[PDB]
Amino acid sequence: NTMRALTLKDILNGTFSYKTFFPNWISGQEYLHQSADNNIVLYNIETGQSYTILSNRTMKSVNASNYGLSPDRQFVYLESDYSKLWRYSYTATYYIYDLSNGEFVRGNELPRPIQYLCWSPVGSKLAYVYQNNIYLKQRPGDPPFQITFNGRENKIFNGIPDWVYEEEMLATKYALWWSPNGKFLAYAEFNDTDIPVIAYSYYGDEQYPRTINIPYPKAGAKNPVVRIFIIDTTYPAYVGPQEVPVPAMIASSDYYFSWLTWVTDERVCLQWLKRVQNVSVLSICDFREDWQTWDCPKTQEHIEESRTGWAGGFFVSTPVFSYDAISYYKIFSDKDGYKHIHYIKDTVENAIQITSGKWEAINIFRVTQDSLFYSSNEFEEYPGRRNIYRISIGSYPPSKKCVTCHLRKERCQYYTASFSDYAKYYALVCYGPGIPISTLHDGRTDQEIKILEENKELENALKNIQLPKEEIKKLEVDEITLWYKMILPPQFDRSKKYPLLIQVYGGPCSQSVRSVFAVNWISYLASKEGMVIALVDGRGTAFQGDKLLYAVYRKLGVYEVEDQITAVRKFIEMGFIDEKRIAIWGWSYGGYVSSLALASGTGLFKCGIAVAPVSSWEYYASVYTERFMGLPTKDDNLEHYKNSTVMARAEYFRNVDYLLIHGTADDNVHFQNSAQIAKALVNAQVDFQAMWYSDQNHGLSGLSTNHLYTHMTHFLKQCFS
Amino acid sequence: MRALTLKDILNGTFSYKTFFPNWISGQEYLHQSADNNIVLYNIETGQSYTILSNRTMKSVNASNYGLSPDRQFVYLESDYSKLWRYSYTATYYIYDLSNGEFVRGNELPRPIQYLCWSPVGSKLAYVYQNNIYLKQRPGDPPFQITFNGRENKIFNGIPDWVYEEEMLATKYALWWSPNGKFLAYAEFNDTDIPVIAYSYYGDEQYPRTINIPYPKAGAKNPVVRIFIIDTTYPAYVGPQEVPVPAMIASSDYYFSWLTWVTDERVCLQWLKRVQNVSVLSICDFREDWQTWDCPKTQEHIEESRTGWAGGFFVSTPVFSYDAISYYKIFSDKDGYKHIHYIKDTVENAIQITSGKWEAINIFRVTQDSLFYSSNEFEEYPGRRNIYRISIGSYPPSKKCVTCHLRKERCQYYTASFSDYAKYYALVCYGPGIPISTLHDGRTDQEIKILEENKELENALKNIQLPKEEIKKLEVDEITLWYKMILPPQFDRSKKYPLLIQVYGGPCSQSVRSVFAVNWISYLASKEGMVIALVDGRGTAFQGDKLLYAVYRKLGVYEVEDQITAVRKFIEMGFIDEKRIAIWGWSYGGYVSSLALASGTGLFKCGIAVAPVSSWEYYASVYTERFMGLPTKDDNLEHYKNSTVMARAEYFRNVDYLLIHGTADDNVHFQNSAQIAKALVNAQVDFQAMWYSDQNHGLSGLSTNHLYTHMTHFLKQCFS
Ligand SMILES: *[C@@H]1O[C@H](CO)[C@@H](O[C@@H]2O[C@H](CO)[C@@H](O[C@@H]3O[C@H](CO)[C@@H](O)[C@H](O)[C@@H]3O)[C@H](O)[C@H]2NC(C)=O)[C@H](O)[C@H]1NC(C)=O
Ligand SMILES: CC#CCn1c(N2CCC[C@@H](N)C2)nc2c1c(=O)n(Cc1nc(C)c3ccccc3n1)c(=O)n2C
Ligand SMILES: CC#CCn1c(N2CCC[C@@H](N)C2)nc2c1c(=O)n(Cc1nc(C)c3ccccc3n1)c(=O)n2C
Ligand SMILES: *[C@@H]1O[C@H](CO)[C@@H](O[C@@H]2O[C@H](CO)[C@@H](O)[C@H](O)[C@H]2NC(C)=O)[C@H](O)[C@H]1NC(C)=O
Ligand SMILES: *[C@@H]1O[C@H](CO)[C@@H](O[C@@H]2O[C@H](CO)[C@@H](O)[C@H](O)[C@H]2NC(C)=O)[C@H](O)[C@H]1NC(C)=O
Ligand SMILES: *[C@@H]1O[C@H](CO)[C@@H](O[C@@H]2O[C@H](CO)[C@@H](O)[C@H](O)[C@H]2NC(C)=O)[C@H](O)[C@H]1NC(C)=O
Numbered sequence A: 001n002t003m004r005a006l007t008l009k010d011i012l013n014g015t016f017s018y019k020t021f022f023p024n025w026i027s028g029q030e031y032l033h034q035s036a037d038n039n040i041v042l043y044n045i046e047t048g049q050s051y052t053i054l055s056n057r058t059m060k061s062v063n064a065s066n067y068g069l070s071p072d073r074q075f076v077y078l079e080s081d082y083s084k085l086w087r088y089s090y091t092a093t094y095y096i097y098d099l100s101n102g103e104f105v106r107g108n109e110l111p112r113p114i115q116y117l118c119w120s121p122v123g124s125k126l127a128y129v130y131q132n133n134i135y136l137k138q139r140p141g142d143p144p145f146q147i148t149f150n151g152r153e154n155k156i157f158n159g160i161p162d163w164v165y166e167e168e169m170l171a172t173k174y175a176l177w178w179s180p181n182g183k184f185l186a187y188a189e190f191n192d193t194d195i196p197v198i199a200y201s202y203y204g205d206e207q208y209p210r211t212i213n214i215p216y217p218k219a220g221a222k223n224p225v226v227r228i229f230i231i232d233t234t235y236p237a238y239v240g241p242q243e244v245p246v247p248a249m250i251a252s253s254d255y256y257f258s259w260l261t262w263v264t265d266e267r268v269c270l271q272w273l274k275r276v277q278n279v280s281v282l283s284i285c286d287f288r289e290d291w292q293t294w295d296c297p298k299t300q301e302h303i304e305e306s307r308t309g310w311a312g313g314f315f316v317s318t319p320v321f322s323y324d325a326i327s328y329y330k331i332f333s334d335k336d337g338y339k340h341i342h343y344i345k346d347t348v349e350n351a352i353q354i355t356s357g358k359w360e361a362i363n364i365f366r367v368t369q370d371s372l373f374y375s376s377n378e379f380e381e382y383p384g385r386r387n388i389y390r391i392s393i394g395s396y397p398p399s400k401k402c403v404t405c406h407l408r409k410e411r412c413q414y415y416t417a418s419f420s421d422y423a424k425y426y427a428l429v430c431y432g433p434g435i436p437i438s439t440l441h442d443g444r445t446d447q448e449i450k451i452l453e454e455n456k457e458l459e460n461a462l463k464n465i466q467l468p469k470e471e472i473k474k475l476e477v478d479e480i481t482l483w484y485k486m487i488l489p490p491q492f493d494r495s496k497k498y499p500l501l502i503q504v505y506g507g508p509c510s511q512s513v514r515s516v517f518a519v520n521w522i523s524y525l526a527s528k529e530g531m532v533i534a535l536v537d538g539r540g541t542a543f544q545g546d547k548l549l550y551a552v553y554r555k556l557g558v559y560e561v562e563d564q565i566t567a568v569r570k571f572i573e574m575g576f577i578d579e580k581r582i583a584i585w586g587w588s589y590g591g592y593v594s595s596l597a598l599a600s601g602t603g604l605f606k607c608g609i610a611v612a613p614v615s616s617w618e619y620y621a622s623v624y625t626e627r628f629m630g631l632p633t634k635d636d637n638l639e640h641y642k643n644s645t646v647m648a649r650a651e652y653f654r655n656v657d658y659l660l661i662h663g664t665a666d667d668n669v670h671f672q673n674s675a676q677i678a679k680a681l682v683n684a685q686v687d688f689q690a691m692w693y694s695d696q697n698h699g700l701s702g703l704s705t706n707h708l709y710t711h712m713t714h715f716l717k718q719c720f721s
Numbered sequence B: 001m002r003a004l005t006l007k008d009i010l011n012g013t014f015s016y017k018t019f020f021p022n023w024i025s026g027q028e029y030l031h032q033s034a035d036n037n038i039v040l041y042n043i044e045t046g047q048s049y050t051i052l053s054n055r056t057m058k059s060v061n062a063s064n065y066g067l068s069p070d071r072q073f074v075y076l077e078s079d080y081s082k083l084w085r086y087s088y089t090a091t092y093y094i095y096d097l098s099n100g101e102f103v104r105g106n107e108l109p110r111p112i113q114y115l116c117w118s119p120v121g122s123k124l125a126y127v128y129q130n131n132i133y134l135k136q137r138p139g140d141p142p143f144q145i146t147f148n149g150r151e152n153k154i155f156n157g158i159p160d161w162v163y164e165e166e167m168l169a170t171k172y173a174l175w176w177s178p179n180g181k182f183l184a185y186a187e188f189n190d191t192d193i194p195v196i197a198y199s200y201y202g203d204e205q206y207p208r209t210i211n212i213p214y215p216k217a218g219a220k221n222p223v224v225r226i227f228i229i230d231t232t233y234p235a236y237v238g239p240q241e242v243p244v245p246a247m248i249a250s251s252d253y254y255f256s257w258l259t260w261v262t263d264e265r266v267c268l269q270w271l272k273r274v275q276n277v278s279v280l281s282i283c284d285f286r287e288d289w290q291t292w293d294c295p296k297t298q299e300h301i302e303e304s305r306t307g308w309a310g311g312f313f314v315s316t317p318v319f320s321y322d323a324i325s326y327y328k329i330f331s332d333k334d335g336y337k338h339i340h341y342i343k344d345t346v347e348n349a350i351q352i353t354s355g356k357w358e359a360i361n362i363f364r365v366t367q368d369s370l371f372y373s374s375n376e377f378e379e380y381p382g383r384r385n386i387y388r389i390s391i392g393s394y395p396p397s398k399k400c401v402t403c404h405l406r407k408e409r410c411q412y413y414t415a416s417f418s419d420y421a422k423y424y425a426l427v428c429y430g431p432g433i434p435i436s437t438l439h440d441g442r443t444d445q446e447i448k449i450l451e452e453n454k455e456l457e458n459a460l461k462n463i464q465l466p467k468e469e470i471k472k473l474e475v476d477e478i479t480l481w482y483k484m485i486l487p488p489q490f491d492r493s494k495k496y497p498l499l500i501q502v503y504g505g506p507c508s509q510s511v512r513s514v515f516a517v518n519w520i521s522y523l524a525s526k527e528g529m530v531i532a533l534v535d536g537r538g539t540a541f542q543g544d545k546l547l548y549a550v551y552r553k554l555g556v557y558e559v560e561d562q563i564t565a566v567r568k569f570i571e572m573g574f575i576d577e578k579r580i581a582i583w584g585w586s587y588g589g590y591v592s593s594l595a596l597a598s599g600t601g602l603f604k605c606g607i608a609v610a611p612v613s614s615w616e617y618y619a620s621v622y623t624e625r626f627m628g629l630p631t632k633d634d635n636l637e638h639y640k641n642s643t644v645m646a647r648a649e650y651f652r653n654v655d656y657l658l659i660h661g662t663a664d665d666n667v668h669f670q671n672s673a674q675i676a677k678a679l680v681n682a683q684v685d686f687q688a689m690w691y692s693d694q695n696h697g698l699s700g701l702s703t704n705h706l707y708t709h710m711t712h713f714l715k716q717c718f719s
């Protein structure tokens, strides 16, 4: 064979895709996995042997795409008829299979379509959502008991989140949680009745288009109301569902429900977040026997507030409880402003700092009897790497071990972990910089037992490909460090002038300079079209302390734009960039940033591309916008909501080539955002190129993705030649 | 001295003025002068006086006026709020001219959808919240005629969306009798019609949905009931329904138009939903029952075995002074639309005009004369000349008033007649600079020049305008008339890039002797391009064989005829076969898209502005007229085969530019949304542009942006 450059076709077909192995743990030494001919194999690590538990002929009999083994292993649910709704939500038909009998569960059949379904943590209890209502099945073939009755489509939601909670708050399709032993079922009740709706046309394949209404609260609009209830699953008819008391300081004004964490069958932990998202409350509630309800004392309310910015990051960090079920470990900012692990027993005041330094603790994976596992930046001071650490708890001389630092140093510096029951064994998934690799380790010695997915097919395929060189370096301008990823063309010469493309996102709590392997569009642009690509992380980006993160608080569309400009000026003075041929592209938040950078009036960028951009913070969800911007009122931050729009910079797009793209059925960043930019450019008498994608979601999935990346390539090749 | 610039076209620098007198009597007319005073001019005693001052108009921000026939009052129209093509809502103020003060009292409500005076006296008729009200005297409390008017459902006195656009082409649906004794009105019911919903972004946090009851091809149609009310005693017997003919009511139907003959005689025109047959029913008033009798003996059928009834509309009759007979334009034995004279029956109709040319419109039927416009002169179908023929005199007369009035300059006319045709005005639209003159209605002599356009004549002195030529091609027994616009200092030895401007819809004509300084004049004047406009099968005024050729076969012959013409223009030697383009709007957007995806390799690039993509998405009134019903028993097969989306894979080696306004109520954005979706599925690249919150015509700074964007696309395509 002969070495060849990447093609656009290779990227669109996903020829250089990688496989990942996350074991579906069922016990401390057992896990499930789908085989090549679609069977379900049960691998036991201690015994070393595997067996088929659910055959391909049983899955094909009902056109099943997914499965779910019950904890007691008596039954397995068969998921078929997947019908996607929003980012996480989907509807499906569920078939219970009796493994012990060798036949499907016939009788009090499950309805269709089911919005969410799950087993209890022990036994064969079932909980499901149908027509925004929760139902309970003690045994698979038993008639269901209806828990909720007010569920109405697009108005009252039970057991599943509404649009805004699914997207910006919970980031999941469910809103119900079983207690550790299935004694209680906790759930949430969302009321979207008075929220204004977003309406958009869906053309489809019928003579007339249909309107799609979604209750969506834009910045400052009426928000949904939430009521968390806990019902006794053993005797639901006795006292019924009990509402969980909301803390006095949370209920004083509008509030959000952050997350629910079960501690024991008689103790649950709820997190609340005031509408002004700079103060969160961790309330611990205990079950009482004299009232059959949940008592929430003032003594068990732990406040976490941020005087500089917002509480947490994308979410308010969840606590990981100790074996004693009274104390917990949580990640939050220290005195210096770095998000580190703390240990809280009684009160927040007496919290003990577990990790410290000019780096951040990202996630706590497991809190065992003697070990604590977590991921961090620490290794070699690179904020874009992720490594797994293991620290001792309770032992007199403490231990601290980096499991993955030197596991495969050159190839692997971005890991994630998946723990078996009680951390007896665990799996590490390496995502880059090299070819991703999934391995399985002993939970006591950290030793690698076997390679789950090595990716030898992708390694051989890439042999004859001229992949670009990726470099993660930093710039130090005016006490502000800018980390950047530069993608260089094959056979790169520091004496030549290369056209430059900037890929931007820059949204608060984000990070785009990571040691992650990816064979994407910008890899093709550097491999075949000889372009230099750059990704810069400035103010507002996460994992480098709160001074960097909270710098964009109430000032969106200002520093993230300036930092891309500062970086381009620095890349130009390196000598290998053609100052005449520079471009910037982005999607969503990156579409807002590239539009503002292109209309900055600096003359650095020749052309720019904005895909589904945000044009004004008055058009985005209250949950995201108000977290980083505040209220759009005269008494608060209305002034900056008006000054931070793309439409106010319309006259500045006169000598630059602008390409504006947006999907007509975008439920997340509505088409209204691009419709307003286009209207402002028309009024300003400014020429630009545009593209719409009919009936397409925010991500433009399908043949639209092909068309988009082809259309953008044509625009860049014209701009650069 | 200098070439035209895009800015000159966008600003309307080379615009022309037109003078249509607002007749009030047989020798008088009103006109809003330079200082915005309403002046009255008398032709006989050549005197003028200001009847409504600029101070009176400015006091209520008035943009329009309406003098009552008795001249006691004048309505002052202000707060104009456009709705659809013709409809608008405004505030009206009655001014008492005799007293010198505004009419105080039972004030008119706001906003009023339509308002008009009776043909005599001070009677008022107006539509408010889809209901008709009557004011005997301006300061009197109104008498409510209708009560069922509900927004977007029941319409009274005004048409619904589809009747306003495709059927009446007017903002009103009420007609006063010749002396104001009776008021006739329409009642439209859109209750079960499916609606078209589209987002209107506006300037608020959330966009709003706009719903319009719009019947697409084959969908449920609005129902119509016509009534007549005695305006002297409307409480006595009330509104009486006009009997619908037995053969019209048998299935779905349309009300075509209403024509008052005398106070006690009215003429109604009906159209069957299968638009190949129309009925002219004459109804008389009966004292005995105070109702309208419509006999079978007074039903005149007009059917078309080859195609549809009429042109864009079913021609209206013009009655004689005897009020029993009438003159109507329709096809003869040979297939040419000529004037006929009907006394008793359609069978015994007498053909008034004949030949291989068409009579376009009947302007006025007087006691001894008949005025009409036609093609006849020098056999040019794109010309309009006004003729006068005698009626009643033993040896008949026939003269062409306009033919040699100004032969080189003027060959496209229109006429505005004063009360009883005592005087009339001729408006020349081209080929030369438009001119409006005033003629004596008895001798046809020119009395004065109303608007000569000397400002535009002087402005164009230093402008080297392109040469326009109207010629014809004769291929396979089919004559194609074309207008070619040549660059200044055109050389027949050089190769020039070619742009085709297309419309090609049924009943249309784009090769006319009309003066215009438009976008394509700039493209030829500054960008050295040859421009062409071809009229093939489906275009009107050349007989029914040409017109009905596209019957039930839309998107086929009009496309082929543009291709046949380009092949002929190429073999002329001065066209660069490598640089050819085609642009069109609306129907022209459908034709240019199909021509670009024909697979002939003639066109390099094409532009489609607000195109129709499938006949499933367009108005039933227009679509089922030339294509029939989209059912298995009728023409569903061709409805499916005549789509732009079915030709998606053919746009692969051509440059396509697709433009469409998001708030287009006429040709919905759905049409372009479907084309874009098909091109994505076919993996075909194209350039696109949307216009937020803009109507079908993209009026305002959106026009500026569109014409600029299209110029860039063509400049790039022709380099
Ligand atoms: C846009 O087009 C309009 C015409 O539709 C232009 O308005 C006209 O501009 C010309 C030249 O500036 C004016 O002509 C001069 O008028 C004076 C009397 O006012 C006369 O003494 C001169 O001999 C000459 O004819 C004209 O008055 C003016 N207005 C009208 C009603 O025609 C306008 O200027 C164009 N815009 C641009 C930017 O060119
Ligand atoms: C508007 C907005 C917004 C903010 N936002 C969020 N949040 C948190 C989660 C909830 C969400 N509502 C808001 N997640 C995001 C982004 C974002 O702009 N981009 C850029 C981006 N996005 C996409 C889709 C891209 C696709 C291709 C290339 C680069 C891309 N870059 C992202 O990638 N992700 C994952
Ligand atoms: C779909 C469709 C359609 C049919 N249509 C109608 N009818 C009768 C009245 C009722 C209506 N529903 C249907 N009037 C039309 C057209 C049409 O295609 N074009 C072409 C055109 N249109 C526009 C707007 C143009 C603008 C610029 C240049 C060329 C243009 N060429 C016209 O000019 N006019 C005046
Ligand atoms: C699209 O990409 C897939 C891989 O994602 C290609 O399929 C592979 O083809 C090679 C050919 O040697 C096989 O050995 C692999 O086993 C295939 N992998 C999978 C996952 O099927 C496919 O060929 C690509 N499409 C095209 C047209 O090249
Ligand atoms: C307007 O049209 C609607 C629908 O065609 C009429 O309503 C129907 O009238 C019939 C007869 O009175 C009833 O039996 C139906 O149940 C009605 N259907 C609906 C959908 O309402 C309505 O009466 C008409 N109104 C006028 C004033 O003509
Ligand atoms: C008017 O047009 C209609 C079209 O629907 C003609 O009706 C057809 O007549 C035949 C007679 O055998 C029927 O079988 C069909 O169902 C009808 N439609 C078609 C096109 O198949 C009607 O005859 C025409 N009338 C006139 C006077 O020309």
Ligand SMILES: *[C@@H]1O[C@H](CO)[C@@H](O)[C@H](O)[C@H]1NC(C)=O
Pocket: A150, A156, A191, A193, A194
């Ligand atoms: C939901 O909210 C509406 C409107 O605010 C209110 O009327 C109703 O009581 C609520 N319903 C439930 C079940 O919470």
Ligand SMILES: *[C@@H]1O[C@H](CO)[C@@H](O)[C@H](O)[C@H]1NC(C)=O
Pocket: A276, A278, A279, A305, A306, A307, A308, A630
């Ligand atoms: C939280 O935000 C509000 C509004 O900006 C501010 O007034 C308040 O003091 C902040 N609270 C803390 C603890 O920072």
Ligand SMILES: *[C@@H]1O[C@H](CO)[C@@H](O)[C@H](O)[C@H]1NC(C)=O
Pocket: A643, A644
């Ligand atoms: C508005 O925003 C611009 C940046 O887009 C900034 O330069 C200006 O100072 C802001 N403030 C006001 C009051 O305009």
Ligand SMILES: *[C@@H]1O[C@H](CO)[C@@H](O)[C@H](O)[C@H]1NC(C)=O
Pocket: B034, B035, B036, B037, B054, B055
């Ligand atoms: C109003 O008309 C008078 C008389 O023609 C004139 O003098 C005056 O200038 C006009 N005012 C305006 C505003 O045109």
